[PDB]
Amino acid sequence: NPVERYVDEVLNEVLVVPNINQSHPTTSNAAPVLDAAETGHTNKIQPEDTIETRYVQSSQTLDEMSVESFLGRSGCIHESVLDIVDNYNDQSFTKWNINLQEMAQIRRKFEMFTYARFDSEITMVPSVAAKDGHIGHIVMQYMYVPPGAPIPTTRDDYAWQSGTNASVFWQHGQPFPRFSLPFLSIASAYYMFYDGYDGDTYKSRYGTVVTNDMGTLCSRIVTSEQLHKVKVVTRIYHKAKHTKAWCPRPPRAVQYSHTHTTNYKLSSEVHNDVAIRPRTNLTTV
Amino acid sequence: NPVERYVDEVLNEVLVVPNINQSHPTTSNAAPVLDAAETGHTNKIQPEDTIETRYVQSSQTLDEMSVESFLGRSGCIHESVLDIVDNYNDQSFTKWNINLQEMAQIRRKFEMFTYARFDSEITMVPSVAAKDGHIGHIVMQYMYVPPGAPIPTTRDDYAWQSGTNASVFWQHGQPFPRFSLPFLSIASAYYMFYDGYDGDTYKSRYGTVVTNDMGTLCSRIVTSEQLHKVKVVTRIYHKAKHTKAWCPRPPRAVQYSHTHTTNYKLSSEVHNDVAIRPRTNLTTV
Amino acid sequence: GAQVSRQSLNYFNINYFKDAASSGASRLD
Amino acid sequence: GAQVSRQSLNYFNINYFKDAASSGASRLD
Amino acid sequence: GAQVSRQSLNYFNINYFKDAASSGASRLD
Amino acid sequence: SDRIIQITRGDSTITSQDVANAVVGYGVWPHYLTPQDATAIDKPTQPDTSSNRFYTLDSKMWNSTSKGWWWKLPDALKDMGIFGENMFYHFLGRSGYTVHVQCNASKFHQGTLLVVMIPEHQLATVNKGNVNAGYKYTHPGEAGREVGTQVENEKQPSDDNWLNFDGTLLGNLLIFPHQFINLRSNNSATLIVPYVNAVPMDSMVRHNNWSLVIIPVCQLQSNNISNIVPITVSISPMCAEFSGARAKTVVQ
Amino acid sequence: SDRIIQITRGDSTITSQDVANAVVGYGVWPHYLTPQDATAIDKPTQPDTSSNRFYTLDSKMWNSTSKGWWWKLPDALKDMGIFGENMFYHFLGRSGYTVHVQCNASKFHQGTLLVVMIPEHQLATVNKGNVNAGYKYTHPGEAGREVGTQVENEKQPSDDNWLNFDGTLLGNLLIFPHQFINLRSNNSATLIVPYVNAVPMDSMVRHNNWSLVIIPVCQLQSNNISNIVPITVSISPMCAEFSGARAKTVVQ
Amino acid sequence: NIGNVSMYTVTLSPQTKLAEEIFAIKVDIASHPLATTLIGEIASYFTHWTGSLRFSFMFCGTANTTLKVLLAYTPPGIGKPRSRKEAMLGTHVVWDVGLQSTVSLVVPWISASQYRFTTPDTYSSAGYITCWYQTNFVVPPNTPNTAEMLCFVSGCKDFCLRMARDTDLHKQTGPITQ
Amino acid sequence: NIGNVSMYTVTLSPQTKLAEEIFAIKVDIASHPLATTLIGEIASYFTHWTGSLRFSFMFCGTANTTLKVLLAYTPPGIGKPRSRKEAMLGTHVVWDVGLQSTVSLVVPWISASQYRFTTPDTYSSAGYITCWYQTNFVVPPNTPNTAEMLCFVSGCKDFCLRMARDTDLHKQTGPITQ
Numbered sequence A, B: 001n002p003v004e005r006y007v008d009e010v011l012n013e014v015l016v017v018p019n020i021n022q023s024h025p026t027t028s029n030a031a032p033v034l035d036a037a038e039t040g041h042t043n044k045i046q047p048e049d050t051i052e053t054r055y056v057q058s059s060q061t062l063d064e065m066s067v068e069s070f071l072g073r074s075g076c077i078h079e080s081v082l083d084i085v086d087n088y089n090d091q092s093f094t095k096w097n098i099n100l101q102e103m104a105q106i107r108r109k110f111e112m113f114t115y116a117r118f119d120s121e122i123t124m125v126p127s128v129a130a131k132d133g134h135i136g137h138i139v140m141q142y143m144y145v146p147p148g149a150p151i152p153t154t155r156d157d158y159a160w161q162s163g164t165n166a167s168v169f170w171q172h173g174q175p176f177p178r179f180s181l182p183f184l185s186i187a188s189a190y191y192m193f194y195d196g197y198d199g200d201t202y203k204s205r206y207g208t209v210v211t212n213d214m215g216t217l218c219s220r221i222v223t224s225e226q227l228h229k230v231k232v233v234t235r236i237y238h239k240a241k242h243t244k245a246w247c248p249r250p251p252r253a254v255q256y257s258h259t260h261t262t263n264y265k266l267s268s269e270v271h272n273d274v275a276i277r278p279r280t281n282l283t284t285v
Numbered sequence C, D, E: 001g002a003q004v005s006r007q008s009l010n011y012f013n014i015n016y017f018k019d020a021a022s023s024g025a026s027r028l029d
Numbered sequence F, G: 001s002d003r004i005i006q007i008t009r010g011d012s013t014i015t016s017q018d019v020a021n022a023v024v025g026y027g028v029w030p031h032y033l034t035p036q037d038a039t040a041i042d043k044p045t046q047p048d049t050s051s052n053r054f055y056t057l058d059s060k061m062w063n064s065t066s067k068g069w070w071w072k073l074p075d076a077l078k079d080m081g082i083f084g085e086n087m088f089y090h091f092l093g094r095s096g097y098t099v100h101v102q103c104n105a106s107k108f109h110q111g112t113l114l115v116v117m118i119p120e121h122q123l124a125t126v127n128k129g130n131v132n133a134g135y136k137y138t139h140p141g142e143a144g145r146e147v148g149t150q151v152e153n154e155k156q157p158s159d160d161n162w163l164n165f166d167g168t169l170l171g172n173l174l175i176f177p178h179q180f181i182n183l184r185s186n187n188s189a190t191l192i193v194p195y196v197n198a199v200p201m202d203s204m205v206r207h208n209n210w211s212l213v214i215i216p217v218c219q220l221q222s223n224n225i226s227n228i229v230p231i232t233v234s235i236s237p238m239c240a241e242f243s244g245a246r247a248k249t250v251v252q
Numbered sequence H, I: 001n002i003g004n005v006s007m008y009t010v011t012l013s014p015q016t017k018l019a020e021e022i023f024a025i026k027v028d029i030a031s032h033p034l035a036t037t038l039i040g041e042i043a044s045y046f047t048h049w050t051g052s053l054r055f056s057f058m059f060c061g062t063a064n065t066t067l068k069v070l071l072a073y074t075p076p077g078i079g080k081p082r083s084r085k086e087a088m089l090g091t092h093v094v095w096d097v098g099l100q101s102t103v104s105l106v107v108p109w110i111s112a113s114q115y116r117f118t119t120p121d122t123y124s125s126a127g128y129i130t131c132w133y134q135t136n137f138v139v140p141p142n143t144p145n146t147a148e149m150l151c152f153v154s155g156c157k158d159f160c161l162r163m164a165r166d167t168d169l170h171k172q173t174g175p176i177t178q
C-alpha cells in the first residue's frame, strides 16, 4: 500500500535490520565459527552462533545508507572566479570544462563505485565582492555549451545569444539559481574508472578523459562596465538524483593530484601519505 | 489514455524509432540497392537489405527533434541600449522596429522553413550599469506600439499614457519581465521568405519587409533624472510556442548582411565565405 | 483551466491564464 | 503530475515539471 | 502528505516535507 | 568430494584435487548479448568451441622476494589462437572468462597468494604529474607484468602493490571477486567472471575490461628452497562474440 | 527483371544488371554437415557472417591473346580474413561457395568467356614422365594462374587450355557446372556450388575441392583496344565449418 | 573546386592500373565533406547521433558507358584501407552500372556506445567509406573518355539526433542591419 | 611495516613462555588500525554506529603446523586484559588450527546506549580484542619455525550506521588540476 509505504518514508523505516534471537549452549560437530577464507566468501556467522544471546527487537533502519542517500547530498564541484582588475572586456567572462574530479570530497564518494548513473541537480551560489565599494546591478549569464557548440571568445560573442543552448540568467538579490540535468552519457552509465585508451599508439590518452566529456560552462557578467570593480565568485554545487551504482571499490587512500587519473605522489616517508597511524607494536592499543 | 500519454511526455518517449530486424543472405533478381535518383525520390533501402543484421530493440526517441523543440528555445533577438551621457531627456528613451532578423542564431533556425506559425514568449533581461557609482531606483516601461499607433517623440510624450497599448513596467530588483504574444500576422502564417513586391515598379520593395511589419517596441526609463548616470541594456529573448512550419529549405550557408533580405557578400577567396573546409584531394580523409 | 485525468495517477494539466498564447510548449503529434 | 492515494490519509506525490530529471530524490528498493 | 477529514467541514492536515522532524507542533494528549 | 574440480571448455579439461570452491564474479554467469541491450546492428560471429577454450599463459616463478604479477584481459589472450584472431579482425568484441590459477608446493611449504579480478583497473603513475600509463605498458600480453623488475620510464605504471597500483589500499581488494591460494589448503583458484562494462560490446584492442592481479600476501617459505614453485594461469573465454568485421588491426 | 541480381552474404552485397540467370552446381544448395554423414566427433566451429562473405580476388586483364586463368578452392581464399585463419588453425574444414565472375565491356565489344567449376581437377604435366604437378604450382592463392605465361619447370602443370590441363577436350567441360560470359548478353556469371567430396570434411591445406577455370573461347575484339577490359572474381564461402583446432599451420 | 558545381562530382575514366582508389571520406556525420549536406547541418544542431546512413551514387556517363565499382565501409579501430583487398574485408557493395543509374550503400550502426558525438571525437569516430574500381570504366569508340558521378546522403529508419546545441557551421561576426 | 604487505600479517612462532600475548587492538570501528578497512572507511562517513562485528583469522603456516589460540573480546569499563586468564573471563573463542584455515570471533553489541560515536569518544569506547597462545605453535622437524596469520573484519546482520558526515580519513591540501 503506497500510503503505508509513505509513512515508512516519513519515519525513515523502509529498510529494517533483523532482530537478534535468543540462543542456547551447544555441543555439536557442526562448527559455524570455522571456515575457509580461501573461497573468497565471508563467513556468515552471527552473534547467536558464538554466544548465548537474548532476544532483542531491532529498530534500526538502513535507509540513510542507501546509495541515493550517500550520493544525494549537494557538494561543491567548482569555484568560478570573475575578478575585474584592469580590463572589463577580458575579465568579465570565463569558461570551465565540466567534471566531478576537482573537489576531493564528492570525487571520493563517487569513486567508491566503478560505474554510476544519475540525474544531476546543479545549484549555484554567486557572491559579489564590492572591491571598490558599490556593486551596482549585477546580472549573470551561465551558458551550458555541449561539446561541439561554439565557445565564446569575447564578452559580446554571438554565441551568448543562446539561440539553442540552455542559459540561466541570475539577478543579484534573487534566490540561488538551480536546474536539473538528465543523465548525459552516450553510454548506459558514467565511467568512474576506465582502463582504456582512445587509440592504440604510444600517444593515446588513457583513462576517463577519453569517455567523460560533458562540455563547457561559460559564464559572463551581463551588466556592462561599471565604475566600481567587483569580484564575482560563483560556487557550483552538484547533487546526484535517481542514482544507480555498480561494482564497489576500495576508497581513495592517498591524495588526488590530477583530474581523470589515479596518479599520486609518494614522499620518502610513506606513512605520512596515508591515514594509517603507525602503531608502537602489536599489543599497544 | 491521456495518462499513458502523460508518462510518455515525462520520459520523452512519444516518438519511438523502429527496431532493426534480423536479416539473412539473399540471392534474388530483386535488387533494392539499385534505383534511379532521377525520379526525385530517396531510395528507401534499410540496413536489413544490404547486410545480415541481428535483431535490436530501439530505445531512441525523436521527441527532441520535433519542430516545437527545435524552435522552442529562448534566444536573444535584440539588445536595447539606453546610455545616459549628457542629455537625460533625449537619452532616456528609445524605439526598435521589431523583427527576428538581427541575430543570426535564431534567424537561421526559423529560415530553415518557408512559412511558420507560432505564438511568442518574450522575456526581457535588463541590466543597469552604474557608470557613476549608484543606480538609485530604476523603473522601466516597455510599450508595444502596433503599426499606426502614435510613436513617442520625447520621454514625456502623451503616448506613454498607454491608454490602449500594452505596456510592461519593471522595477529593478524584481524578476525578469515576461509575456506572451498571439500569432500576430494578417495572413495564416509568417513569411520567412517572400518572392514578391509591394507594387509593380522599379522602385517597389522586395522581400519580407513588405509582409512582416510587427510594429515598434518603445522603451523608457520611467524614473526622472538622477544625479548618477546609468547605462541600461535590455536584452530581448524570444521563444516560439505552439509552432507549425511548412516547406523546409537549405540552411543559410553564408553570413547574413541585412535584415529582410537574402543578400550576401563574397570575398575573392570564396572558400573563406562558406563552412566547407578545402580537401587536399579526393582520397585524403 | 484543468484537465484532470485518472489512472491512482491523476494528471492536472492546468492553464493559468485565459488566452491560448499563454500556455506552455505544445504536446506532440 | 499527481499520484493520489487514499487510506482518510491521502497522499499527493506531485511532479511539478515535465521531465523525469526534475523530480526529487527517489524512493527506495 | 494530507489527512483529509470530512464533516461540510473538511480538514486538511498537510505535511509538506518527507521527514517527521519537519512537521509543526504536535497535537495534544 | 568438495575438494575436486573438473572444468571442461571446448577441447580442454582442467582438474584440481585441492580447490577452495569457485567464485562467480558478482553472481552473474557469462551470457551472450540480448537484443534488448544490443546497439551494434550487424549479426555477431560466435566461434564457440574454437575460442571458448582454456589458453595457458607463460608460467611465473614465485620466490621469497616476489612482489606480485598482473595481466589484463582481453590483452593477455591477444595472441591465443582463434580468440586472438577474432579480436583484431573485428572492431567490437564481448566475452566472459574462467580464470584458473595453479600453484602446487607441499605440506611443508607455506605461502599465500591473493588472486583478484578487478574491473576497470585504471593504473596510476607515481610522482610523474599528469603523465598517464603508456599503452605499451598496460598491454604486456601473455607475459603480463612482474611487479618490481621493470626499469622505470616516464610512462611506466605504479609498481606499489600495497597501493593496488592505483592509490587504494591492498587490504580492500577483497571487495572485488577474489580467492586465496593458501598452500596449506588449496593448490588452485577458480573465478568465473561475466562481461562487465557500461557499453554492450567494446574494442578489445583499446579497452581492457578485467585485470587479474596476484599478490603474495604471505611469503613463500620452506626448508627446500631449491625446488622452484611456479604459478601458472589458464584462462578460458566464455560466450565470446565479435562484431564489425574488416581487415586485421596491427598494433604498434 | 530477369536480367538483374543482388546477392547478399554477410556484410557484402553484389549486384549485376545483366546476368544470365545463375547455376546451382548439381542442383544442390550448400548446407551444414548432418550427424548422419559426420565422422569427426568434436563440435564444429561455424564463423557464420565473418566467413560467409564475398572476398574479391586480384583482377586480371583480358586481351586478344589471353589463353585463360584458373584458381583452386579453398586455396584462393587462404589469405582472406577469418575464412583464411580458420582453414589453417583447424585440421578439417568444409564449405560451399558462391562464385561471381565480373566482366563488363560495351555494346561494340565482342568476346566470350567459358566459366567452369570443376570438382577434383587433378592437373597433368606434359612430356615429363610420371612427375606430377608440384604443390607450389597448384596453390597459387588469390593470384591464380595465368595460362601461357609461366616459365616452365619440371613440376609445372600443363598449360594446354584445349586439353583442360588434364588430357580431356575443352568442348566437353560443359558437363561440369558452368556459364558463359558473352559480352553481347551478360556482364557476369554466378555459380553456387555445394561441398563435393568422398569424405564429409577434409584438410583445406592439402586438398583443393573445386577449381574455377575461365577460358576465352571467343577472342576479345573491338575498335577501342586501348581500353583495358578486366575480369574480376568475387567468391563467398557458404556454410563454412571447421574442426580439429590446434596451432596455426604454416605452409612452406 | 569550391565555388563551382564541380565540387559535387567525382570523375571516372579508363584506368591503366587495376583496383585504383576513387575517393575516401570519413563517415562521421558532421565531419567534412559531410558537414554542409542537409543531414550534416541538422546534425550540427545536436550533440549526439546514432543510426545507419544511406549513401547513394548516380552514374552520369553515356548510356553506352559501363563500369563496376566497389564501395566499402570500414568500421573503426583500424586505419583507412590502403587497397581494394583491404577495403573489401569490411562492409561493401559491388555496383554494376546499367539501366538503373543509382546504387545505395548503407553504413550500419556499428558502435560500442549507443550514441556518438556529432563533433569530431576520437572515441566516437565512425570509420571510413572508400570507393575502388572493381573492373574498369569501358566505352565504345567515339564516346567521351570521362564521366561524372553524383553522391548523396540521408538517414535510415533508425537515424536519431539528441541534445540540441548551437551550430558551429554558421557565425555572425558583426551586426545585421537594415 | 607501513608501505609493505607485511603490515597485514601477524607472525606466530614456538614460544618458550606459556600464555603469551599475540596482539591487542581496540574494537572501535573507526579507530586505528580498523580505520582503513572498508567497514572503517564507510563508518567514517557516518557519525553513529551499532551492531556486532565479525573478526576472522586465517592461518597461513604449513599443513603440518598446529596451533591453538584464544581470541577474546573485553567489554568496556575495564582496562585491556594483562593476561590470558584476565582476557578469557570475557567473550572468547578458542581456535584450533586444522583442515579449515579460518575462524571467526563475533564482538557482540554490548553497550549502554543503542548507538556509539564512530569518532573516538570516551563514553562510547567499545572495548578490546586480544589474542593469546592457548597451547603453542608446534611443527615437525624441517618445517619453517614461523608462520603468518591474516586478519579480516566485516559487520554482522545488525550492523548499522547513522548520520552522514564528511570523512576525516582523506583530505585535499591543494587544487586538483588537469
Ligand SMILES: *[C@](*)(=O)[C][C][C][C][C][C][C][C][C][C][C][C][C]
Pocket: C001, C002, C014, C015, C016
Ligand atoms: C482554469 O481555467 C482555472 C485555473 C484556476 C487556477 C487555480 C488552480 C488551483 C485550484 C485549487 C483548487 C482545490 C480544489 C479543492
Ligand SMILES: *[C@](*)(=O)[C][C][C][C][C][C][C][C][C][C][C][C][C]
Pocket: C011, C012, C013, C014, D001, D002, D014, D015, D016
Ligand atoms: C502533473 O503532471 C501536473 C502538476 C500540476 C501542478 C498544480 C498542482 C495543484 C493542483 C491544485 C488543484 C486543486 C483541485 C481542485
Ligand SMILES: *[C@](*)(=O)[C][C][C][C][C][C][C][C][C][C][C][C][C]
Pocket: D011, D012, D013, D014, E001, E002, E014, E015, E016
Ligand atoms: C503529502 O505527502 C504530499 C504533499 C503535497 C503538497 C502539495 C499540496 C497541494 C495539493 C493540491 C492538489 C489539488 C487537488 C486537485
Ligand SMILES: CCCCCCCCCCCC(=O)O
Pocket: A098, A099, A100, A101, A120, A122, A144, A181, A184, A190, A191, A208, A212, A214, A217, A236, A238
Ligand atoms: C553545468 C554544471 C555541471 C554538470 C555536471 C554533471 C555531469 C556529471 C558527469 C561526471 C563525469 C566525470 O566527472 O568524470
Ligand SMILES: CCCCCCCCCCCC(=O)O
Pocket: B098, B099, B100, B101, B120, B122, B144, B181, B184, B190, B191, B208, B212, B214, B217, B236, B238
Ligand atoms: C515585442 C517583442 C518582439 C515580438 C516578436 C514576435 C513577432 C514574430 C514575427 C517574425 C517576422 C520576421 O521577423 O520577419
